[PDB]
Design a protein around this ligand. Structure first.
Ligand code: HEC
Ligand code: HEC
Ligand code: HEC
Ligand code: HEC
Ligand code: CA
Ligand code: CA
Ligand code: NA
Ligand code: NA
Lengths: 357, 376, 125, 125, 377, 354
């Protein structure tokens, strides 16, 4: 059952029959060979993904599903900080609430409704047998049950060790089964002494048992609009991605422009970066942080364009207290961090490291 | 038996074991209460100084406030704010002088007002708590100016502005009785009543001369604003108690702290804040020891406690330490605080018995002045 | 008490200079001026920078990474001063150097040194 | 070394708190911070105001008026601190009171206290 | 044996009284700066205000003091013409608006002759390292290290009394000036960087070769004799790197061991604050050493080894008889060895030849750490 | 000898035959019964004195001759402060050089020349004998010798115990013979702790053997012109009294407006005060020092006039480091000072106080 439900999810996950035109499965955009992200080229490069219709582009980068099962369900903590949830703006509560969405999203898999999804599941005798053994007879006859069952099978599948194996070098090193290179060890020291750790470590203090390099909080780090992705998405020149403020139920204008801190696990192989896939290279994502600390003019220029980073999409609610650390990362420290962030790659994606390198 | 550092070690070990997460942050001091005690370190005339905020109950430092040269600390009896008149210089101890008043939130210790005092008008002197004083209403702060002549400055803490200087006769110390009046002690041996309008020469009334030319009243009389009791020792332990509630000075019978015998064997008051006054208990505490006539600023190893009404010795404590300054919490079952400048340590005593309960050491360089709120 | 002897950590009193987390602290322990093991006193401003050390915890046999942080914007507390240097490296390895006033990132540009906190930020490898 | 005992003036060492002229000195002896018995250290500003005291000179049995003057505009020296109070009257008799910072008339309006000199201004009475 | 200075004064005041000798109460001048003047700075364990003591080392007498702000860097012009410090004050003691500034003082009247604001609060606030603020050899420029947001060096013109410019440097530390427009720094990678700077333009930065492994640790208080261009840099183990900068480029001298291997086998290591002094005229190194665990390297030491800087030969091992944090020597012949104890707040003044304690000056503030002498001869 | 000399001086000092019209002697202006000052009402009150001729008035007030013999000879000391000499502007070096000047001053005794002075000395058989025994035969037949020898007798006369008796109550108290009244003692304490002792004591520190309550220095304390005295002097309203700078050979502009610190001995009985007699009461003169320290409105007003003190006659070289003590003298302290100053009255003038 705990195995069988994940097993059913495994099948759904790769089944393109869950898309309108049958071209697209979860695996299409969350490609297992690419740490569950989208290797496909669209009108905005790798920044945003193309739906089942073969034309529609999303407005956000497709995030890894690796370690997404470690994120807590979305909640407000006692200090008034929102934490957890799924999607960049935390608008899904958890994996199960997220799962049905790509399915019905006309920009993604674009099934017209629950009833069309159920009908798909029905046509396959393996589903009828797999679903019925877990959820009961006639489950596939009830669109609401079938759709929820599918979401739960998918959520259970993403919670398996296949998605969060913890077998990165970093893990191996924390187990004492090996050591960091000197560069890696310095990256690690920087990471934990500089401001990164104020957002990219599970805990404020103490040691986490299954660290995924995010505190699950929401921060506006002052990223500019990704012009090409925003063109591809068709959302308009006047459109503002309000991040967490777009979550239904969030009204507080202080949440405008804040996004979930992503896990750094497999960061090395899941470029391009940030919620709109604005930066292609890992080192560029790191350099971006120097714009709050460095006085050198170069710190204000995106190295990938040679132009200013650009005005923040949302100029208010910047995490200035954390971002303006009073210390700039020199290049030695940025190299050290890249090396440290690469130790975060799962074993099976270690071969992908060569091409990024 | 477990010290505060030890209990802290254990709670920390347990949060680690349990994997408890907590956010590193800025603490708020515990709300001001009867047992809070403030120790001002005038630091032997150093140009910058510290005030320690101390939980008298746990004997724990719960915060600190920095001050300038010989700042005058004031503590609102109701616990709603602390303030000080302080003096800084643009180059440590030299250059442009700024006198100012700062008002602090008593839990975050953040400054809530910073009020420049024109024309560098503070009296710079070893700290006499009653050289700067809050009005009962807490809305005004009055500070003494010696130079070019005795004067009193009026600070509006409400509009956060300096108002003006009051011209007074040849007098010293400031004991506010009301939002527009305060008493001072004069050279001719009277007290002067100063009532200040919004404008004009304040109207100034002298009491009768109440002590001879060759009788010497200490720099640190105890004054209880809420009781209106001005308690004032002389060099010999003769204590003038003056009732100031009623808006005019009723002179209370004079009392003697030491026995006519004891003063024959050389018992005299001595130290800094030589006297404490507990309002509800109606008691005087006095630092005493055997000393020459002219060692009147030295530490004392003994405290005597006497009824403010009768003058009967209620106790004699051997403090066990060289104590320069005493004060008391004004709650019931008061602590008697006994500050040693030399040990830099606040010894916190039970005022009823005199048992040493706890102490907080490392209180600056030469702590001298103990202040407490009167909250009840 | 032999200052030159190998430092021996204890896990039983955080106000003492041999407390295990203070193995590379330099200054005053914030617990002695109104903060706590990992919080700053009222009125001071918590820095975001830190120097780190790997400190052996004799309670659990584990070494932990302690990322020290200063409470800034007040004159030095003068209470519980301590200077330990376990693993402490010279200023050119500032990550591990503890003469630096690590007040960076403190609110209001506070850079005066009041005291230091000793939070754990990870296990040591 | 018994602080409450009679003060015993000596005419043999000015850097000692029992030197005869320091009989009503409060603070620090200027001779220990680069002044002398009757001169201010460099950098400080000599006040024109003073508190006086009649001080007994053991050596001739005569009694001299010492009009103490403050050297101002530095932080307190920290050296040879002394507080004696022979003849010392409370603040409302300022001429003989020594808690006051007698820095009045110091050049540049210097009012911070550094140390005190002990010059003779007359014979007593 | 012998008459203390306070006794000599009592005697002479008594004689003037007896003879009706008048004298005008006034502000003394300090005696002219000389080879035996020694400055002791008291960082006061990070206090917001601090003191420097001007001392006649021959007499063991405090002849003056200078106030400073938070962790000031003192400099003393080698020729005696002035002293200066870079200092930091705040408008409300240790909070509010920060003003970094440099003050120059007349070394006799001790009066400030210049007060130079440094814009944008650029000082490195660190436990006092003498070589984090440095005079050029002609005394016209003061260079101060900045760490935040990145390593940089501020240039201050003491002659025109103005701040000039920040220089961007690599990931490097300390400032050993060698010329009116050049200094060296030590880099994280184990090399030295030479920084050549103009009024404007990108500084000319050159790196020497790496001269020490990543696992050999160079202390924060190397001795640097500007006049000899000798940089004497101990490691944690008492291995001493010597770099000769006198040709205006770095020549690496042979390493000497301050301790023998028996001693190292038995846990002798340098330790303290200013662990090392260098007498230029004798070409001798003084190192504070003691038996200590390897991570007790900032604790006081009770012994000074004196070694010939060319051969590495040990010439003496003095038992200082006190807990000494910092040493330094006068630069005249027959030098004094100054032995400052932060714990005792006392400068012990020793004969550098026999190691014998000669006299001491006590009551030097709260945590005096830094001894500076001018090299005048 | 020195006795006989002083006795000849004593003869000359009361002799009006040393004036043009023989209507006036030294004692006329320096009346012994008024502590050697001028009791005579002139056009400007007692601010200034009238010459032999009947209408010539001076521009300075006639100082006492008591204790004048303790003033050192004029000199610049090593700190560069001029000290000593005679007249308010120090223009005479010593008493001897001073004595002759009134004899010859046309606005005072107004003898045309030394020889007219000599002739008058011959007229008196007592002088031939007195002079000849001290200075030798023919002394009076030579105007130069006669005149110098007369100045010498006068100087010797003023150096006798009679001019500087040290028998004031102040003197008696310092000898342990008597005590000060509480107020006198307060005043003494005030005098020696406030700025007065920075100028009106002989020494900076230590004990003076014969204190005359002056350091003999020159100070401009910023005094205004004396209105009527200046009019009476006929020196004109354009005139500036430059004090010490008027001494020939003093060329230093810093000394403009500076006057010798008077001895305060007998100060109670030698009103009016200051170089120009501008203040009639001692209290007023004491109060004038508050114009530098007090913030209060009365500071500014001369109480004898009820109006502003007046601009300084000489606005520069004010002794500000000294006058600006930062502290104001209250009523009680001004009382105490008057009491203290009256103790500086010589015994024989103790009856002059009321
Ligand atoms: C391309 C058309 C996609 C297909 C098909 C699927 N996903 Fe996806 N995923 C996509 C984007 C563009 C985003 C981000 C959108 C946003 O608004 O933030 C996502 C996000 C998720 C997440 C959240 C991960 C996180 O917040 O860190 C999960 C758990 C997820 N996707 C799972 C998922 C499943 C189960 C799918 C098939 C049913 C599926 N995705 C399809 C892009 C696309
Ligand atoms: C909170 C103020 C943060 C601090 C400090 C740092 N990071 Fe961050 N990081 C943060 C957020 C909120 C995000 C997503 C921003 C968005 O809107 O898209 C990020 C992202 C990264 C990434 C990209 C990861 C990915 O796209 O999957 C990297 C590589 C990253 N951050 C690294 C990083 C480092 C190295 C930091 C110290 C220099 C650091 N971050 C600080 C939030 C915050
Ligand atoms: C009134 C016309 C006078 C007669 C006659 C004499 N003196 Fe005089 N004396 C007078 C004045 C107005 C002044 C000061 C004028 C000035 O220029 O300052 C003096 C001054 C002296 C002094 C100096 C005293 C001092 O400075 O304190 C001496 C010693 C003195 N006078 C002596 C003196 C003698 C010996 C006379 C007879 C020859 C004589 N005076 C006549 C007023 C008048
Ligand atoms: C030097 C700055 C002085 C200080 C301080 C004080 N006095 Fe003075 N006094 C001074 C001078 C130069 C003079 C003569 C001024 C002039 O131009 O005429 C005086 C005068 C007096 C007098 C008048 C004496 C007389 O007329 O014979 C009195 C009574 C007097 N001064 C008193 C006095 C007191 C009490 C002071 C302290 C408050 C004081 N003086 C200060 C020089 C200086
Ligand atoms: Ca990505
Ligand atoms: Ca007169
Ligand atoms: Na793009
Ligand atoms: Na919303």
């Amino acid at each position: 059952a705990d195995d069988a439900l994940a097993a059913l999810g495994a099948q759904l996950f790769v089944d393109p029959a869950l898309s309108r035109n049958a071209t697209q499965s979860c695996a299409t955009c969350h490609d297992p060979a690419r740490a569950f992200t989208d290797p496909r080229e669209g009108k905005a490069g790798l920044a945003v993904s193309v739906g089942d219709d073969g034309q529609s582009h999303g407005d956000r980068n497709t995030p890894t599903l690796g370690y997404a099962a470690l994120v807590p369900a979305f909640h407000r903590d006692a200090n008034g900080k929102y934490k957890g949830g799924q999607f960049w703006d935390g608008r899904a509560d958890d994996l199960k609430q997220q799962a049905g969405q790509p399915m019905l999203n006309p920009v993604e898999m674009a099934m017209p409704d629950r009833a069309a999804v159920a009908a798909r599941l029905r046509d396959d005798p393996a589903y009828r047998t797999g679903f019925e053994a877990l959820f009961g007879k006639g489950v596939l006859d009830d669109p609401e049950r079938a759709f929820d069952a599918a979401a739960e099978a998918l959520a259970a599948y993403q919670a398996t060790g296949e998605f969060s194996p913890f077998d990165s070098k970093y893990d191996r090193v924390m187990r004492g089964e090996e050591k960091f290179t000197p560069l890696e060890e310095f990256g690690y020291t920087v990471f934990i002494t500089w401001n990164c750790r104020l957002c990219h470590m599970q805990r404020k203090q103490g040691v986490a048992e299954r660290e995924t390099f995010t505190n699950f909080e929401y921060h506006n780090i002052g990223l500019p609009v990704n012009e090409t992705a925003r063109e591809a998405s068709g959302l308009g020149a006047d459109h503002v991605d309000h991040g967490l403020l777009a979550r239904p139920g969030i009204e507080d204008p202080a949440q405008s422009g804040r996004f979930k801190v992503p896990s750094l696990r497999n960061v090395a192989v899941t470029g391009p970066y940030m919620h709109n896939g604005v930066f292609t290279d890992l080192r560029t994502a790191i350099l971006f942080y120097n714009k709050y600390t460095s006085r050198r003019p170069e710190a204000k220029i995106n190295p990938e364009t040679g132009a200013p980073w650009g005005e923040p999409e949302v100029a208010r609610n910047l995490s200035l207290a954390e971002l303006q650390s009073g210390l700039m990362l020199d290049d030695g420290r940025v190299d050290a961090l890249v090396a440290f962030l690469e130790t975060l790659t799962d074993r099976r994606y270690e071969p992908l490291l060569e091409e990024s390198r | 038996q477990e010290t505060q550092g030890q209990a802290a070690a254990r709670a920390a070990a347990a949060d680690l074991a349990a994997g408890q997460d907590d956010e590193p942050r800025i603490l708020e001091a515990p709300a001001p209460d009867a047992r809070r005690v403030y120790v001002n370190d005038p630091a032997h005339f150093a140009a910058v100084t510290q005030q320690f905020v101390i939980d008298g109950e746990a004997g724990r430092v719960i915060g600190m406030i920095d001050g300038g040269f010989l700042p005058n600390p004031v503590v609102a009896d109701d616990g709603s704010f602390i303030a000080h008149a302080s003096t800084v210089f643009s180059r440590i101890a030299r250059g442009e002088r700024t006198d100012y008043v700062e008002v602090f939130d008593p839990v975050t210790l953040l400054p809530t007002a910073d009020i420049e005092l024109p024309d560098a008008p503070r009296f710079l002197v070893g700290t006499y708590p009653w050289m700067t004083s809050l009005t009962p209403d807490g809305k005004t702060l009055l500070f003494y100016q010696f130079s070019p002549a005795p004067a009193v400055g009026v600070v509006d803490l409400e509009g956060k502005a300096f108002k003006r200087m009051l011209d007074v006769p040849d007098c010293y110390h400031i004991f506010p009785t009301a939002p527009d009046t305060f008493f001072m002690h004069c050279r001719d041996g009277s007290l002067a009543k100063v009532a200040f309008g919004t404008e004009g020469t304040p109207e100034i009334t002298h009491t009768e001369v109440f002590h001879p030319e060759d009788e010497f009243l200490i720099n640190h009389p105890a004054y209880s604003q809420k009781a209106g009791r001005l308690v004032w020792p002389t060099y010999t332990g003769k204590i003038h108690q003056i009732d100031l509630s009623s808006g005019d000075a009723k002179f209370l019978p004079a009392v003697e702290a030491l026995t006519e015998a004891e003063r024959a064997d050389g018992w005299r008051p001595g130290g800094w804040q030589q006297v404490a006054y507990h309002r509800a208990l109606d008691r005087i505490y006095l630092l005493v020891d055997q000393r020459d006539e002219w060692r009147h600023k030295t530490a004392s190893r003994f405290v005597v406690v006497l009824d403010a009404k009768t003058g009967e010795r209620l106790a004699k404590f051997e403090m066990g330490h060289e104590i320069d300054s005493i004060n008391v919490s004004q709650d019931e079952k008061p602590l008697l605080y006994a500050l040693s400048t030399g040990d830099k340590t606040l010894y916190i005593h039970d005022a009823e018995s005199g048992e040493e309960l706890r102490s907080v050491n490392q209180l600056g360089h030469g702590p001298q002045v103990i202040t407490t709120a009167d909250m009840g | 008490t032999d200052p030159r002897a190998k430092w021996v950590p204890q896990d039983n009193d955080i106000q003492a200079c041999d407390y295990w987390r203070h193995c590379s602290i330099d200054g005053n322990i914030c617990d002695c001026s109104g903060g706590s093991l990992t919080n700053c006193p009222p009125g001071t401003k918590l820095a975001t920078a830190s120097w780190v050390a790997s400190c052996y915890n004799p309670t659990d046999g584990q070494s932990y990474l302690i990322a020290y942080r200063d409470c800034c914007g007040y004159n030095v507390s003068g209470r519980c001063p301590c200077l330990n240097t376990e693993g402490e490296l010279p200023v050119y390895r500032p990550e591990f150097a503890n003469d630096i006033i690590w007040c960076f990132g403190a609110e209001d540009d506070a850079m005066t040194y009041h005291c230091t906190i000793s939070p754990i930020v990870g296990k040591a490898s």
